[PDB]
């Protein structure tokens, strides 16, 4: 809670945590979580700790409709998470302590990070995508979003989620905008270094989406972690976080 910070976007308060190394000037990563997740998952905290140990600061915010941030979950879209992203980027870019700016996204947060970097290719220095969930578009086009089914041509107002997200309702506007989201076209505009990290045992997002990111990016590396799952659980967390810190290390 010592690390707690907040910013505003359109009248919504976004709640985050700021982690800094010793010393008053540093590079800064913006770390983005996924669909129904929050800013304090094990993986995101591990990334932040590994970055700090590397003299790289970080902020991680709950997207609107998630965690401690304002907004109903059903009012969240990928587009207004990109807007949340833009507000965080403004906060970081105008911060007097910062040198370079990195984007790190897991799952749907990797889509937000990749599109945001495509819109700010002259400002963001590097990107790390961890199992970025570009499948969310094909999922919405098919009428199946993480097990919840619906007619993709008569999308209801809200769609009840199933499984772990039982009780939660995704907005129809989330699904309608997902169907037409130009994920790779916008993301492609980022020509600076990208590292794409994905588990060979990812059952939630087909690793072909991570492969396609690596194909369209001019300057990228692909890291397939054998046997890792979508969440990078257990021992895989350390592997994914290590690769993330590797890519963003200051090179002293």
> Which of these segments, 7-15, 18-26, 214-222, 227-235, binds a second copy (CB under 8 A)?
7-15
Place of tokens 């905008």: 177
CA angle 241, 246, 247 (to 5 degrees): 105
> Which of these segments, 34-42, 69-77, 97-105, 124-132, binds a second copy (CB under 8 A)?
69-77
Binding mask 171-190 for a second copy (x = CB under 8 A): --x--xx--x-x--xx--x-
Percent of the chain that is helix, strand, coil (3-state, to 5)? 35, 25, 40
Which runs of consecutive H residues, i.e. helices, occur in the chain? 42-52, 78-93, 108-119, 135-142, 172-179, 183-187, 208-216, 235-248
- Minimum CB–partner distance for residue 36 and a second copy (Å): 19
Distance (Å, whole) CA 18 – CA 67: 16
Residues between 197 and 226 with contacts to a second copy, criterion CB under 8 A: none
Place of tokens 């129809």: 172
- Minimum CB–partner distance for residue 10 and a second copy (Å): 4
Show the tokens assigned to 170: 């995704």
Binding mask 49-68 for a second copy (x = CB under 8 A): ---------------x----
Nearer to a second copy, 24 or 151 (CB): 151
Show the tokens assigned to 91: 């906060």
Distance (Å, whole) CA 95 – CA 104: 18
Tell me which of 20, 42, 74, 75 binds a second copy, using CB under 8 A. Answer: 75
Check if the beta carbon of residue 17 is closer than 8 Å to that of residue 4.
yes
> Which of these segments, 10-18, 50-58, 95-103, 207-215, binds a second copy (CB under 8 A)?
10-18
Tell me which of 32, 83, 129, 225 binds a second copy, using CB under 8 A. Answer: 83
- Minimum CB–partner distance for residue 12 and a second copy (Å): 5
Residues between 104 and 143 with contacts to a second copy, criterion CB under 8 A: 118-120, 122
Cβ atoms within 10 A of the Cβ of 179, count?
Answer: 17
Tell me which of 1, 11, 24, 251 binds a second copy, using CB under 8 A. Answer: 11
* DSSP structure class, residue 74: G
Interface residues with a second copy (CB under 8 A)?
Answer: 9-12, 64, 70-71, 75, 77, 79-80, 83, 86, 90, 118-120, 122, 153-154, 157, 173, 176-177, 180, 182, 185-186, 189
């Amino acid at each position: 809670s010592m690390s707690r910070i907040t910013i505003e976007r359109d009248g919504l308060t976004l709640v985050g945590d700021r982690e800094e190394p010793f010393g008053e000037i540093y590079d800064m990563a913006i770390i983005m979580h996924g669909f129904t997740a929050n800013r304090n998952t094990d993986l995101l905290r591990q990334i932040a700790d590994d970055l700090r140990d590397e003299n790289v600061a970080s902020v991680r915010f709950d997207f609107n409709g998630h965690g401690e941030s304002d907004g109903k979950f059903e009012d969240m879209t990928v587009c207004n998470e990109i807007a949340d992203g833009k507000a965080i980027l403004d906060y970081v870019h105008t911060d007097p302590h910062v040198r370079d700016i990195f984007l790190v996204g897991h799952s749907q947060g990797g889509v937000v990070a990749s599109m945001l970097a495509g819109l700010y290719p002259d400002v963001v220095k590097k990107v790390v995508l961890l199992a970025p969930a570009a499948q969310l578009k094909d999922d919405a086009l098919r009428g199946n979003t993480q097990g919840a089914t619906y007619d993709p041509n008569h999308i209801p107002d809200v769609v009840p989620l199933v499984g772990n997200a039982l009780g939660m309702k995704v907005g129809g506007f989330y699904l309608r905008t997902a169907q037409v989201l130009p994920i790779y076209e916008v993301s492609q505009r980022f020509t600076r270094p990208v590292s794409v990290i994905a588990g060979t045992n990812d059952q939630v997002v087909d690793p072909k989406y991570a492969k396609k990111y690596d194909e369209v990016y001019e300057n990228s590396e692909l890291h397939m972690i054998p046997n890792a799952d979508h969440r990078f659980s257990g021992g895989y967390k350390d592997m994914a976080a290590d690769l993330t810190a590797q890519f963003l290390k200051p090179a002293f």
